[PDB]
Amino acid sequence: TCFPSFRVVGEKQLPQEIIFLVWSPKRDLIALANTAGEVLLHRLASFHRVWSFPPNENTGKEVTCLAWRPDGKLLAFALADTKKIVLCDVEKPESLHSFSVEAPVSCMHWMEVTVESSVLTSFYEDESNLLLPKLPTLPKNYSNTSKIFSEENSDEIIKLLGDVRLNILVLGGSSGFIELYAYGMFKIARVTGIAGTCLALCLSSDLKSLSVVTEVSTNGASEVSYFQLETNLLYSFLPEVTRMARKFTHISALLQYINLSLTCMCEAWEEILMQMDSRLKNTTTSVQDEQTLLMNQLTVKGLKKLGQSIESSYSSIQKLVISHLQSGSESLLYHLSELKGMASWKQKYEPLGLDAAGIEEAITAVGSFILKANELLQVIDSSMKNFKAFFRWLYVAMLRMTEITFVAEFLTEHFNERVGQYLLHFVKRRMENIIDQCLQKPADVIGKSMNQAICIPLYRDTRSEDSTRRLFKFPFLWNNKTSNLHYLLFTILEDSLYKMCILRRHTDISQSVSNGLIAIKFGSFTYATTEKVRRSIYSCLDAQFYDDETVTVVLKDTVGREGRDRLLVQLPLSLVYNSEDSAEYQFTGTYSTRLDEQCSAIPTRTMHFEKHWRLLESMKAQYVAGNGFRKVSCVLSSNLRHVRVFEMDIDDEWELDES
């Protein structure tokens, strides 16, 4: 009695086509974006929807990619229409952080450096290590995009983002370039000369190399090619870069905070002035001061109790300047000074782009901002002494209405828009200008440090010209963090069947590795209990790495057409790279020309499967989502609306039929 080799824990027919999908790294959750541009998160068990993240003003309405952090504690997605990018908390469908990028994003890969690396020589103090500022929280609940400063007194957002080892979120697209975002926050490189559209991005665990798969178009067809770029600065100076990305993010977060604080005083003071002013009898004069039903609504009580309204407003704005803005300015100068102590060590730090000079200038501009702020505080004192001058002599005039130099102040005030202007002002703009060039230089230096490349072209054909959404799942890139390699999975079409190939290179660019190229023909499918054997002609509809040693595959039987025609197959690498006859599967050609142009050169291993595979039952299946950790997986269909979720460690409870 026979059980086909996987067990199905859930099946749904989704209301919207699924445009992209990815499993969590550590958990039984899966993430999907549909064509409504909403991001769905689902549980394994009976493919239950955990939450929906629909679009709005700060999202886009069109999402291209999704990337989990290696934690799985943070999901990221890309908005193509509004050209921005969101960092989603897992436990709730809200934007934990977000930022714009220049042009649309077609690919993302979010990496993290080894634990062995995280270890810290201590050049720093509780504040210096910390990634983000925590300062008195901002009364405006409009945080705009990212709620960090606005959310009240939660360390947790900051701890979640920054209390972790260096992690880098790599971005790619058709725009001509690739960016690298430390911590998922600050941009520490931009690489150019990237031709066409990015299909796939993989940055190494050890930061020795970045691999790229890219599609270019001679207008009849398209060519797809693999690239391995060298990231040498990232390797040799890890720790300086991690330290300087920590201080750089922090600094940019301050810039944001002192912006918001400044915004904050301005809107509050604006609205109190408005509500006061137009609250406001035929006789012409503005200055009556030297209308008695002045006193039949607003009274000797009313005067006092407009009074506290206003000195309180004023108190909000000083307290705001000192406690919020000035102390942000202060922290700025502490990280600045530490940064100049970095750039003091000439040889260590600046192959990475910190001018001692630029930092020095930034610091002087900050000082001028603090000082222009201290200068602002007594524009406030004097405005106050006038207003409350006015108030007090007026009070007496109101109860003298029953039974000096700042009388001139009273007149001046009535003529008064005096606080309006005082807040040339924007030193803000110029401070953040100088700082912004300091921050933006390392990005460019490093991106220019990645100029070396390997090129292996893969194939040129019309396969993608027929337009239904491609999902950018394939071809596929995998880093093997234990054996330190790059795997690329791709298909090339021969007999008008797609033949599956596995390419692999050493993470270090100057060194080679066994069996760089090998293809796969699938010979026989059978089980150990039924000795019916399936031997047919199969084409490869998809593939994705399950774990370090295994690859999930989806095949189309060429000959089975209605519902009985597609197969799900686990492929063990230990038998592809099998120690004995691995020597007689060897590439006979050259990487100097395309791979698809020489087929008879590429070694094919005929492999006969008796375990770990299933015919898919009236399924229609096209694409696969592997999870090797939590040992589940998931299969999406031709119509992008139909999913089938398997526990992959278990046989089905359901016995099998065959004719």
Numbering used by the authors: 6 to 129, 132 to 287, 294 to 303, 318 to 430, 445 to 457, 473 to 479, 522 to 757
The publication says:
Only four subunits are directly involved in catalyzing protein ubiquitination (the cullin subunit Apc2 and the RING subunit Apc11) and degron recognition [coactivator subunits (either Cdc20 or Cdh1) and Apc10]. The remaining 85% of the APC/C mass corresponds to scaffolding subunits, of which seven are large multiple repeat motif proteins (Apc1 and Apc3–Apc8). Seeking to obtain insights into these structures at atomic resolution and to assist in the interpretation of cryo-EM reconstructions of the APC/C complex, we determined the crystal structures of full-length Apc4 and the N-terminal domain of Apc5 (Apc5N).
We used the Xenopus Apc4 coordinates to determine the full-length human Apc4 structure to a similar resolution by molecular replacement. Apc4 adopts a bi-domain architecture, dominated by a 360-residue seven-bladed WD40 β-propeller domain (Apc4WD40) split by the HBD (Apc4HBD) predominantly composed of four long α-helices. Apc4HBD is inserted between strands C and D of blade 4 of the WD40 domain, extending away from the wider lower surface of the β-propeller such that, together, the HBD and WD40 domain generate an L-shaped molecule. Human and X. laevis Apc4 are also very similar, differing only for residues 120–130 (X. laevis Apc4 numbering) within the shorter WD40 insert that is an α-helix in the X. laevis Apc4 structure in contrast to a predominantly disordered loop structure in human Apc4. C-terminal residues (758–808) of human Apc4 are disordered in both the crystal structure and the EM density map. In the context of the APC/C, due to interactions with Apc5, regions of Apc4 that are disordered in the crystal structures adopt ordered α-helical conformations (α4, α9 and α10). In the EM density map, secondary structural features are well defined, whereas secondary structural elements at the tip and periphery of Apc4HBD that are resolved in the EM density map are disordered in the X-ray structure (α4, α9 and α10). In contrast, whereas the X-ray map shows well-resolved side-chain densities for residues of Apc4WD40, in the EM map, these side chains are poorly defined, particularly for residues of Apc4WD40 at the periphery of the APC/C, for example, blades 5 and 6. In the human Apc4 crystal, Apc4WD40 is secured through lattice contacts with two neighboring molecules (data not shown).
